[PDB]
Write a protein that binds this ligand. Structure first.
Ligand code: NAG
Ligand code: NAG
Ligand code: GTR
Ligand code: CL
Ligand code: NA
Length: 333
């Protein structure tokens, strides 16, 4: 019931208590854990991934009701051996995602250090899944702007809570791409592209999202809802921003747009956005001098969007094209 190598990992069936020791995952291998239902998995060392040619995920854990106790240990992706400024768009192969977490349970207190590109992929789930007190430290990727597409958390799942986490990276802190009942609370995001829903692709539906209590600094965007211009049979519905404190934003404090991968222009109509609110505690956003405060670029948006608790200052005014939605309240124009 102690995993000391990639081959030990296949031998944990029957273990209600697994200890994950530190070791290196050699080139050409992956670490896959399928723990027993309700098992506790406790990390007792750091896991380092030698430079590899495999596609990600390099680490996959999949189980029901798992209790993962990280004890502040590290999954080290050796990302600087791969980073070339091009991420997953071109250039060197980047194993991605680094980690994949599937099923359900509670995952606490570990660090992902220097992922090659996207760090933690979440989903699908079979019950609630909570990630609590995880650090994605890709800060080294800022050097010479070589880290790219280093998303903290990519979520395509239902019934997820991500709380008390820290992300230092070069792309979305979180990107919520699909699923219902997703809560992102009391996290700290710096260096990247902010807190995102999307990009929303054809057939994907994000609903009942709560973005609460987070701090975002030194980022390209504060919060975004982005849908591919071309997406159809897609939607975002029921999003509440509450109590977020954001500053140091370079491009847009808020960008809600159906023109992706562009920020604005000829927005699509097949990924309707509805019921997007800034309520509860104040969401205060300070943007840089050349930044835009708030832009909404809808081809198809509906509802009474209560933005009473949003305050955005700095930079210049954006544009509001909200289609059928009525945006009330707040301070940003
Ligand atoms: C990738 O970069 C190479 C040059 O470094 C360029 O030839 C190629 O067209 C780029 N990839 C794509 C898909 O455009
Ligand atoms: C998981 O999500 C789906 C849709 O949100 C739902 O039917 C199921 O009730 C949720 N389960 C739990 C345990 O929250
Ligand atoms: O934030 C974004 O949407 C985009 O940022 C760009 O810098 C990146 O090259 C894209 O792949 C996408 O991640
Ligand atoms: Cl290899
Ligand atoms: Na995803």
């Amino acid at each position: 019931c102690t995993v000391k190598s990639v081959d030990d990992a296949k031998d944990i069936a029957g273990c209600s208590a697994v200890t994950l020791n530190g070791f290196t995952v050699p080139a050409g291998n992956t670490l896959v854990l399928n723990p027993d239902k309700g098992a506790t998995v406790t990390m007792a060392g750091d896991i380092t991934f030698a430079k590899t040619t495999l596609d990600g995920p390099l680490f996959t854990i999949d189980g029901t009701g798992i209790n993962f106790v990280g004890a502040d240990h590290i999954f080290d992706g050796n990302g600087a051996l791969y980073w070339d400024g091009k991420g997953t768009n071109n250039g060197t192969h980047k194993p991605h995602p680094f980690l994949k977490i599937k099923g359900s349970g509670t995952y606490k207190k570990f660090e992902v250090l220097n992922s090659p590109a996207q760090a933690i992929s979440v989903g699908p789930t079979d019950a609630h899944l909570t990630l609590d007190g995880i650090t994605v430290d890709d800060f080294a990727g800022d050097t010479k702007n070589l880290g790219h597409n280093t998303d903290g958390f990519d979520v395509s799942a239902n019934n997820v809570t991500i709380q008390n986490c820290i992300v230092k990276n070069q792309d979305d802190c979180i990107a919520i791409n699909d699923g219902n009942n997703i809560r992102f609370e009391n996290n700290q995001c710096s260096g990247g592209h902010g807190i995102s829903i999307g990009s929303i692709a054809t057939g994907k539906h994000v609903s009942n999202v709560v973005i609460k209590g987070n701090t975002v600094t030194r980022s390209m965007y504060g919060v975004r809802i982005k849908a591919q211009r071309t997406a159809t049979s897609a939607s975002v519905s029921g999003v509440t921003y509450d109590a977020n404190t954001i500053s140091g934003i370079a491009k847009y404090g808020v960008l809600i747009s159906q023109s992706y991968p562009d920020d604005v222009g000829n927005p699509g109509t097949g990924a309707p956005f509805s019921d997007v609110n800034f309520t509860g505690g104040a969401t205060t956003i300070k943007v840089n001098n050349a930044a835009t405060r708030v832009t909404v670029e809808c081809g198809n948006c509906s509802g009474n969007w209560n933005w009473s608790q949003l305050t955005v200052t700095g930079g210049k005014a954006g544009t509001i094209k909200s289609d059928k939605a009525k945006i009330t309240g707040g301070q940003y124009l």
